[PDB]
Amino acid sequence: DLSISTCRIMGVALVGRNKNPQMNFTEANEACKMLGLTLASRDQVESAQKSGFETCSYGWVGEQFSVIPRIFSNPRCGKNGKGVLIWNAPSSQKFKAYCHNSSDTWVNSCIPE
């Protein structure tokens, strides 16, 4: 089974395997597709972060690098950074995935508008 953000922010969810190992770029893309989603772009993750989305996991985006959205600094998440922090790693490296749902119309899929 996959782990997924319960509430998507600006259409974005963190998607991971339930246990290690995580996913190379191809595998992350395929996880999003299996859910009927696409791999999110860096811009989509940034829009989510600007509406309150943060995680402590690096995940693939469509630009073929990994990102982490951070609002609060934490030494163990994005090396204490804030914003959407980038890790340029080979496509073979394992990360989670950021997926985007183009059908979402709410800022937070758990907060009705």
Ligand X SMILES: *[C@@H]1O[C@H](CO)[C@@H](O)[C@H](O)[C@H]1NC(C)=O
Give the contacts of 109 (CB within 8 A, at least 6 positions apart): 7, 8, 9, 101
Judged by beta carbon, residue 27 or residue 104, the one nearer Cl ion is 104
* 101 is a site residue for ligand X (CB under 6 A): yes
User: Min. distance of Cβ 13 from Cl ion in angstroms?
Assistant: 11
Residue 37 interacts with which of Cl ion, ligand X, none, CB < 5 to 8 Å by class? ligand X
Residue 85: strand, helix, or coil: strand
Among 26, 51, 64, 73, binds ligand X (CB under 6 A): 26
* 103 is a site residue for ligand X (CB under 6 A): yes
Residue 20 interacts with which of ligand X, Cl ion, none, CB < 5 to 8 Å by class? none
Among 6, 19, 92, 113, binds ligand X (CB under 6 A): 92
In angstroms, what CA-CA distances link 110 with 7, 15, 25, 31, 42?
5, 17, 29, 22, 23
Among 27, 38, 63, 74, binds ligand X (CB under 6 A): 27
The tokens for 37 are: 């989603």
CA 27 from centre of chain: 14
